[PDB]
Enzyme design. Structure first.
Site, PDB file in Angstrom:
ATOM      1  CD  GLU A  49      -3.246  -1.187   2.430  1.00 34.58           C
ATOM      2  OE1 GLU A  49      -3.014  -0.284   3.076  1.00 34.58           O
ATOM      3  OE2 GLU A  49      -4.419  -1.816   2.209  1.00 34.58           O
ATOM      4  CD  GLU A 107      -4.607  -5.965   2.672  1.00 31.41           C
ATOM      5  OE1 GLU A 107      -5.137  -5.428   2.978  1.00 31.41           O
ATOM      6  OE2 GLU A 107      -3.180  -5.575   3.252  1.00 31.41           O
TER       7      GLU A 107
END
Length: 305
Positions: free
Chosen positions: A133, A240
């Protein structure tokens, strides 16, 4: 009969307590439990993503030597997964930052990645994930950091393994086309780049609420990313995703996975967030035998396993 190349779960814990560095194993963080991984393998999952902190694996300077104890436990966790035949994703869970500063040196990042890949170079079931991320940083830098990671990994002789690259905007699928187009130019001599995107289903896409926007929000949030992968000849994975243990979210999850299942020319699969031994009553816990998602969500995922 498995639907996707990969379907499994994050195994969180080694990145816990990120404000405490180095931190203390068993107090600030913990590594995954191989026995519960085995249970998830028996349910049909074949990929486990293992977050860890770059500063705990390679302290002080990312170009330095590993920490013996934290590395030994990363190795043990990887081998516990791969010895059974499943894939282990090595995830420096670092947001494009090292000691809370943006990683602005691709060369330093490349050295870090040669150090890490050298530990796993012979294992074809390891997947290297450049960083979790990237966000709120320069878009060209994100491209260059992903390329530096690939270059470091392949330089170590780790040529059989897939590399999960991640984009800016928290690698969100729903925001991908708006910011991450430049990621199409990444090169890999092994031709094994997979674009890892994350997708949560609450209003702001942060994955902090058990409430999903609507019964179709997941499939909606991945359509333009799917088109981007196809147009650019790329492959992706949802590294995710989660939703709460409720009817709207269960429908959103199934709808998103059913869409991905009709678009496997680009989607290689999906990884739930998260299992791991320190989640307790966490709204998304996939940890056997009592995590809420293990009990209430896993039954809706078995059709994909």
């Amino acid at each position: 009969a498995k639907v996707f190349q990969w379907f499994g779960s994050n195994e969180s814990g080694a990145e816990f307590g990120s404000q405490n560095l180095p931190g203390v194993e068993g107090k600030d963080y913990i590594w995954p439990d191989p026995n519960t991984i085995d249970t998830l393998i028996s349910k049909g999952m074949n990929i486990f993503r293992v977050p860890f902190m770059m500063e705990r694996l390679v302290p002080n300077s990312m170009t330095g030597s590993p920490d013996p104890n934290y590395l030994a436990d990363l190795i043990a966790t990887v081998n516990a997964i791969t010895q059974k035949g499943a894939y282990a994703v090595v995830d420096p869970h670092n947001y494009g930052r090292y000691y809370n500063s943006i990683i602005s040196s691709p060369s330093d990042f490349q050295t870090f990645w040669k150090t890490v890949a050298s530990q796993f170079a012979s294992n074809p079931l390891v997947i290297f994930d450049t960083n979790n991320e990237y966000h709120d940083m320069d878009q060209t830098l994100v491209l260059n950091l992903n390329q530096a990671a690939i270059d470091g990994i392949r330089s170590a002789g780790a040529t059989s393994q897939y590399i999960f690259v991640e984009g800016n905007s928290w690698t969100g699928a729903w925001t991908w086309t708006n910011v991450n187009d430049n990621m199409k130019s990444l090169t890999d001599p092994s031709d094994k780049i997979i674009y890892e995107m994350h997708q949560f289903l609450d209003s702001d896409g942060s994955g902090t609420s058990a409430t999903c926007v609507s019964s179709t929000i997941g499939q909606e949030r991945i359509t333009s990313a799917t088109q981007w992968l196809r147009a650019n000849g790329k492959k992706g994975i949802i590294g995710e995703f989660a939703g709460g243990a409720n009817d709207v979210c269960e429908t959103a999850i199934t709808g998103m996975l059913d869409y991905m299942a009709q678009n496997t020319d680009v989607w290689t699969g999906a990884i739930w967030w998260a299992a791991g031994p320190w989640w307790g009553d966490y709204i998304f816990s996939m940890e056997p035998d009592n995590g809420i998602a293990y009990q209430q969500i896993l039954p809706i995922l078995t059709p994909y396993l």
